[PDB]
Amino acid sequence: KEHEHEQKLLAREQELRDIVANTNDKLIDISMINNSGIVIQGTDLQEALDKRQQEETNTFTLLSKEQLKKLHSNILNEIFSQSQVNKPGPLTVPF
Amino acid sequence: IKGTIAFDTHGNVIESTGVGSQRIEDIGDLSKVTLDAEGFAQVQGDSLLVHLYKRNDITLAVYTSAQ
Amino acid sequence: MLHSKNVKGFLENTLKPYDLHSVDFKTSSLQSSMIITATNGGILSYATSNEINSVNNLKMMSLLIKDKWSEDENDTEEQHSNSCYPVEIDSFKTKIYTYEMEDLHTCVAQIPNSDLLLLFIAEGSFPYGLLVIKIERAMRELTDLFGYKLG
Amino acid sequence: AMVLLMGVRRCGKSSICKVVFHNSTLIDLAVMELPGQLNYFEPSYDSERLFKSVGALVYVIDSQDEYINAITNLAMIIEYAYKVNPSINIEVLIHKVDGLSEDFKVDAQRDIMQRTGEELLELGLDGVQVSFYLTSIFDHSIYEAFSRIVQKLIPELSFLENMLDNLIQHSKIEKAFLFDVNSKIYVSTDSNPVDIQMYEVCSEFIDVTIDLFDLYKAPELQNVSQLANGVIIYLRQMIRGLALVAIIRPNGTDMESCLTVADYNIDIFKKGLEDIWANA
Numbered sequence: 001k002e003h004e005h006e007q008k009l010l011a012r013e014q015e016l017r018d019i020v021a022n023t024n025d026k027l028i029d030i031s032m033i034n035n036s037g038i039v040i041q042g043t044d045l046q047e048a049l050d051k052r053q054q055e056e057t058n059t060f061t062l063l064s065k066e067q068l069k070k071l072h073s074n075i076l077n078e079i080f081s082q083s084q085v086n087k088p089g090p091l092t093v094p095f
Numbered sequence: 096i097k098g099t100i101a102f103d104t105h106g107n108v109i110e111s112t113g114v115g116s117q118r119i120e121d122i123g124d125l126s127k128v129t130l131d132a133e134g135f136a137q138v139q140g141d142s143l144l145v146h147l148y149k150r151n152d153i154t155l156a157v158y159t160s161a162q
Numbered sequence: 163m164l165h166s167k168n169v170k171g172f173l174e175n176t177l178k179p180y181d182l183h184s185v186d187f188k189t190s191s192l193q194s195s196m197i198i199t200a201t202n203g204g205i206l207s208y209a210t211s212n213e214i215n216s217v218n219n220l221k222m223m224s225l226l227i228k229d230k231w232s233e234d235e236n237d238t239e240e241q242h243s244n245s246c247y248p249v250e251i252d253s254f255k256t257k258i259y260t261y262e263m264e265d266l267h268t269c270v271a272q273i274p275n276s277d278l279l280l281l282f283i284a285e286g287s288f289p290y291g292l293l294v295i296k297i298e299r300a301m302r303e304l305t306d307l308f309g310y311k312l313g
Numbered sequence: 314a315m316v317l318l319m320g321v322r323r324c325g326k327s328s329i330c331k332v333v334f335h336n337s338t339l340i341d342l343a344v345m346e347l348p349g350q351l352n353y354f355e356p357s358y359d360s361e362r363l364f365k366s367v368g369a370l371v372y373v374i375d376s377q378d379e380y381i382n383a384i385t386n387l388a389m390i391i392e393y394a395y396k397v398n399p400s401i402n403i404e405v406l407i408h409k410v411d412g413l414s415e416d417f418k419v420d421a422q423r424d425i426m427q428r429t430g431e432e433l434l435e436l437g438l439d440g441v442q443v444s445f446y447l448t449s450i451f452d453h454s455i456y457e458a459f460s461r462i463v464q465k466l467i468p469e470l471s472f473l474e475n476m477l478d479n480l481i482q483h484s485k486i487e488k489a490f491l492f493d494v495n496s497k498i499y500v501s502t503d504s505n506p507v508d509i510q511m512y513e514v515c516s517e518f519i520d521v522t523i524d525l526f527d528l529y530k531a532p533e534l535q536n537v538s539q540l541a542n543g544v545i546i547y548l549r550q551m552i553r554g555l556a557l558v559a560i561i562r563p564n565g566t567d568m569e570s571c572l573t574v575a576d577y578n579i580d581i582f583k584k585g586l587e588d589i590w591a592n593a
């Protein structure tokens with residue numbers, strides 16, 4: 001039965017070394033914070049271009065006004081209306 | 096009307112609806128299309144008619160079926 | 163001085179999503195909305211749409227965003243960048259920078275003539291233009307915090 | 314891992330217990346004191362299970378009184394303790410050494426060691442190693458002695474040493490101790506030497522934490538104490554009664570950035586410590 005305990009101790013040694021390696025792999029230094037490179041400038045068009053690059057000529061040919069003029073203004077107004085945020089009071093209090 | 100795409104002079108999407116929700120990559124092309132004094136334009140591509148309106152430096156593109 | 167409750171309410175209100183009615187276009191809420199410092203990048207105030215681990219991760223993300231923003235604020239070359247949206251409200255000039263953090267859209271804007279920053283983080287499906295409009299209209303209502311410096 | 318305290322009457326066992334454990338395997342359990350007077354030991358008086366249930370036997374010798382008879386009694390105890398169980402670690406504390414010189418202390422420890430070795434040679438015991446610690450209540454010595462005794466009864470010592478060394482190497486930590494909330498018996502540290510002054514700083518930090526928390530109760534212990542030179546002292550409660558106190562140096566960096574990276578690293582370390590059942 002002690003040989004089974006020896007095998008259990010070997011498995012425990014492997015498990016503890018795996019635990020040490022796992023908790024060693026998540027250590028982040030300040031050099032990793034300063035030079036991470038994760039925070040990169042991204043635009044919608046560049047994100048779409050990267051999506052098409054990972055997934056994978058002048059298509060457009062040059063040839064109502066009231067409806068489009070109404071809908072564009074209404075969409076802009078509905079965008080600007082929900083962005084209006086009213087504070088619940090003063091932000092800075094005096095003495 | 097099949098969908099709408101709202102983007103400023105930088106071309107960043109403000110809204111993407113309909114087929115235009117999956118047709119973003121043409122925006123970089125559509126920045127090279129001239130407009131008129133009123134801002135209205137009708138450009139045909141991929142068997143679709145795109146109506147462009149530029150107001151306050153924001154171009155809105157509306158997709159309509161050619162047929 | 164400062165008031166944490168009113169700033170907390172403001173940051174919670176800036177987590178409100180958009181529900182357009184003329185065009186059926188529902189948008190999710192922002193992942194986080196916070197106000198940080200322009201010197202060390204730590205969290206002054208914060209708010210989440212939906213505990214200690216997420217707070218530490220948000221502090222790390224704020225530090226990373228300020229670390230990326232510090233070099234951008236001190237660089238004058240390639241100033242005509244497509245991701246920069248410098249707006250001037252009430253004769254106060256500022257620069258707004260957008261960034262992609264893997265699957266997250268992070269928009270930061272320095273509060274003009276002050277040592278503070280406002281940061282909005284949303285999911286990858288969130289449009290950048292709506293974020294720019296959101297942060298512009300948020301900075302429009304923050305006139306009381308203008309000219310505030312750390313002691 | 315229950316440790317048994319043994320010694321002559323009026324040697325100080327109760328006082329040591331009161332000072333340390335009053336102010337399972339790893340927690341400061343209710344230890345067993347055993348007043349052993351000079352007598353003839355009864356052969357196998359149902360004491361085999363008792364000494365088989367003791368992880369490590371601790372003997373207390375008063376340095377003020379004569380101790381040759383005490384060493385003889387200790388050898389008599391070891392004579393059956395090692396026979397019953399060949400895996401018991403044997404510990405001897407030379408207690409009440411506050412009013413002695415350094416040369417006298419070293420000579421007394423050498424004399425005690427030589428006498429114990431000669432008596433064990435006479436009794437024929439071989440392969441036994443008895444450790445000796447100069448302890449006193451009025452200083453840090455008893456805490457360090459119990460720290461070594463407890464460390465001898467944790468089988469995961471080297472893995473905790475590696476975990477703390479990796480945590481220190483990646484957080485600019487000067488010195489990190491894994492204390493227990495009671496008895497101030499530090500369980501693990503790094504490969505750096507245990508400085509006495511830093512140990513006392515961390516222990517009195519534990520005391521300040523617990524007292525200030527107990528002053529305001531009835532509504533996870535965390536502490537950041539920053540000094541004038543930027544050196545910070547950090548406390549975070551680990552699983553069960555364990556807690557982590559780290560002296561971290563800024564090295565001319567941002568205080569809040571260092572605090573954030575230390576918090577993230579220590580939370581990762583606690584998540585790793587959750588997997589191993591080192592608690593309790």
Ligand SMILES: Nc1nc2c(ncn2[C@@H]2O[C@H](COP(=O)(O)OP(=O)(O)O)[C@@H](O)[C@H]2O)c(=O)[nH]1
Binds near residue numbers: 327
């Ligand atoms: N000066 C000094 N006196 C000690 C120390 N430890 C114990 N004593 C003395 O020992 C007495 C207590 O012994 P006690 O614990 O009751 O003995 P026990 O009941 O046999 O364990 C006290 O009166 C102390 O004066 C020590 O470290 N320094």
